[PDB]
Amino acid sequence: ELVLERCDLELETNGRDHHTADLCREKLVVRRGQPFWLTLHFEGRNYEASVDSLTFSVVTGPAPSQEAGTKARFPLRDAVEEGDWTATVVDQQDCTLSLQLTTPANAPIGLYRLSLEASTGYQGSSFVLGHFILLFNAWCPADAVYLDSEEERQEYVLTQQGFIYQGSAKFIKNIPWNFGQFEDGILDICLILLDVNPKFLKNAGRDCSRRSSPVYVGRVVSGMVNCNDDQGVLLGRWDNNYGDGVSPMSWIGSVDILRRWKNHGCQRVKYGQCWVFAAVACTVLRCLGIPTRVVTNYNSAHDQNSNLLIEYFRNEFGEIQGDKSEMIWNFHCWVESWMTRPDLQPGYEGWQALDPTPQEKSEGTYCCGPVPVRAIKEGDLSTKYDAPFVFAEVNADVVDWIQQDDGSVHKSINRSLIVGLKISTKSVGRDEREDITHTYKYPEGSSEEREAFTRANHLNKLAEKEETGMAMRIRVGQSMNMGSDFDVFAHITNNTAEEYVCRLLLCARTVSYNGILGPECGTKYLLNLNLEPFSEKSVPLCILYEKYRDCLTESNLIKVRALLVEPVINSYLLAERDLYLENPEIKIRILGEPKQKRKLVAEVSLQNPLPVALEGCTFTVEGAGLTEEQKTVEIPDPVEAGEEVKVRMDLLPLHMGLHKLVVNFESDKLKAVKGFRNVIIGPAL
Numbered sequence: 001e002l003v004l005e006r007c008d009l010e011l012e013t014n015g016r017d018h019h020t021a022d023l024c025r026e027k028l029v030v031r032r033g034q035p036f037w038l039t040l041h042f043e044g045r046n047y048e049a050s051v052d053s054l055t056f057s058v059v060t061g062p063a064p065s066q067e068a069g070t071k072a073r074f075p076l077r078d079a080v081e082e083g084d085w086t087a088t089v090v091d092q093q094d095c096t097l098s099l100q101l102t103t104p105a106n107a108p109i110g111l112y113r114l115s116l117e118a119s120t121g122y123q124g125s126s127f128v129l130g131h132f133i134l135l136f137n138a139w140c141p142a143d144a145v146y147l148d149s150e151e152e153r154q155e156y157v158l159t160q161q162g163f164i165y166q167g168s169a170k171f172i173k174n175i176p177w178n179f180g181q182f183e184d185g186i187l188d189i190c191l192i193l194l195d196v197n198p199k200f201l202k203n204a205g206r207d208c209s210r211r212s213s214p215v216y217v218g219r220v221v222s223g224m225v226n227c228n229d230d231q232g233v234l235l236g237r238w239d240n241n242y243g244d245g246v247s248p249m250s251w252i253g254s255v256d257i258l259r260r261w262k263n264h265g266c267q268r269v270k271y272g273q274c275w276v277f278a279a280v281a282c283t284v285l286r287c288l289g290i291p292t293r294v295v296t297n298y299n300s301a302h303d304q305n306s307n308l309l310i311e312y313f314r315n316e317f318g319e320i321q322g323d324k325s326e327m328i329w330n331f332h333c334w335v336e337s338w339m340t341r342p343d344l345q346p347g348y349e350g351w352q353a354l355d356p357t358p359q360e361k362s363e364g365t366y367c368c369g370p371v372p373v374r375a376i377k378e379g380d381l382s383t384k385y386d387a388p389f390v391f392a393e394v395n396a397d398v399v400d401w402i403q404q405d406d407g408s409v410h411k412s413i414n415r416s417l418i419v420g421l422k423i424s425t426k427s428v429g430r431d432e433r434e435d436i437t438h439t440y441k442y443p444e445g446s447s448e449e450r451e452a453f454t455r456a457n458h459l460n461k462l463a464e465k466e467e468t469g470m471a472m473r474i475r476v477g478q479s480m481n482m483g484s485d486f487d488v489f490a491h492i493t494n495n496t497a498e499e500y501v502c503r504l505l506l507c508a509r510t511v512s513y514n515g516i517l518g519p520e521c522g523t524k525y526l527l528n529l530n531l532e533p534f535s536e537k538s539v540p541l542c543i544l545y546e547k548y549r550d551c552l553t554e555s556n557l558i559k560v561r562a563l564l565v566e567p568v569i570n571s572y573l574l575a576e577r578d579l580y581l582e583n584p585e586i587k588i589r590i591l592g593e594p595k596q597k598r599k600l601v602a603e604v605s606l607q608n609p610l611p612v613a614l615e616g617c618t619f620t621v622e623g624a625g626l627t628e629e630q631k632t633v634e635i636p637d638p639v640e641a642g643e644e645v646k647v648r649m650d651l652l653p654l655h656m657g658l659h660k661l662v663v664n665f666e667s668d669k670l671k672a673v674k675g676f677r678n679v680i681i682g683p684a685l
């Protein structure tokens, strides 16, 4: 008799087993290289090896194939064997066959159609079992993305929230972000994002096959975000006016962006900048399975076309003149993902810097990486995918020329600057900052530092100076707040017996995170500054809200610049510092017992730090696990200079475990204020 079956279970169980439970919505989602349960139910009589012959087949792309490893067919048996696409009976009772499928550790990832045919006697029965998505497996020792520790698996693949470090090298700020990779519809969107990539358009079956490599998927996924022109998720913008969309600084996670992309026929979402590029990249990759973590670099030598020596030409005040010069990025962000690397000499497993921010290049404009981080540390520039570029980012040198008024350019000493400070990514499993500078560089003038600089043909720095034994730095005394007046100080130190009479040029300008300077918001110029011997001198500079408010950026960044001139020996000291102005905290109360499918309430508030009223006030809120939906509340009336603004959001968290709730506040005079609360959700009954 021809055997025929009632239904399939593809199961809930595997989700727990595969670390894809939240992801297992209407669909089955598993990670490659790992057995998964599948139970076949049958009408009347069960499967009998003494007659029934079940062979299984799976298919991925639009052009499946045996050679492209994007199709496979295999028989049911008792044990294992080879080829790695296997099916194996685990148990029978009544009319239900309980069995286990395994896919290889290098099967490509994507949507698969699982079909079953008999061959029971002579008469062939044949039909569609169901569908499942197969992903990378940080758990599968044989998979290329394997991590030894559960901790790091959890952090870099499973955790839907974290931190983007922003602010300033001397005051590191951690913006919270909802990566929400397992949020509904997001996996489906990440597939659409690869089924729409330039190479899938060229060949389709080639691309579908190449998605077994995390280097491919990484390079594709990253590139799709903003660069590559044509189709793409985000449109960049930088000039500081974002009225026709949402400003880059206004996003609290990468979910809405993705849905605004898909929900408007895959069109570039209005307005990202580098950290937004990364956070989205991080989401896509995590979703697919490549452990990825967003990284930030302070004083970043971006858009320098690999140049390891940047030079600047500056007037009698210290002001840069080259409108054909590129400024140093206060910070610039990218991501790192984890994979073995079979396409270069061995020993380069690990983190690879993928930078999805398009950079002007030795020919045109595009993305960067993957490149092993270790290579960048080692000086091994020849290592593939943009190693000279990531290297410049972290290792570029800077020469500051002041210009003497007969055509001559006199060299200045500038200690306040070193490219690639404070490289930051969230710790594993905690909210603390990990500092990863050491994975990129060796300490200055160490044995190993110069070993690496040789392999990069850098050298040419430093073991050098002009020595006048005067130093200068910029000091802030204490922290200062957006909306305040406050002072910063030029700090000169004279450690000799000479008494100099000096010129000192102090300048504060509003700036943006990538480096664009605005108008000055305070200046003090001194022409007979008396520095007495073996002494120190602090020169005050008043910076007024009334003076930075018009042009201040949502990054709340002000650059202080100072030039000390010794006229007798013609000596030039330069000191620069980027300040960050604090926003008010967002006070967040969590009301009720945090419980699964139980109403929760979030009380959210801040107090107005400006001396003028806030209008158009709005809070926004989201968090994977806490709401299925972004939530917003517009507060109708102005909030005056004194007072507070408070409102409640209703939440209905559908998942247990820890979740960051992330909140944005917006207003006419005060934008992109951020907040977060860690909420642990327990069980209902």
Ligand SMILES: Nc1nc2c(ncn2[C@@H]2O[C@H](COP(=O)(O)OP(=O)(O)OP(=O)(O)O)[C@@H](O)[C@H]2O)c(=O)[nH]1
Pocket: 168, 170, 171, 473, 474, 475, 476, 477, 478, 479, 480, 481, 578, 579, 580, 581, 582
């Ligand atoms: N809001 C804000 N606070 C800052 C910033 N930089 C430093 N602070 C805080 O200001 C205080 C002084 O930090 P420092 O960098 O030591 O200040 P400084 O005036 O340079 O003094 P020295 O370190 O002694 O040279 C510390 O509490 C910092 O956390 C900033 O850019 N923005």
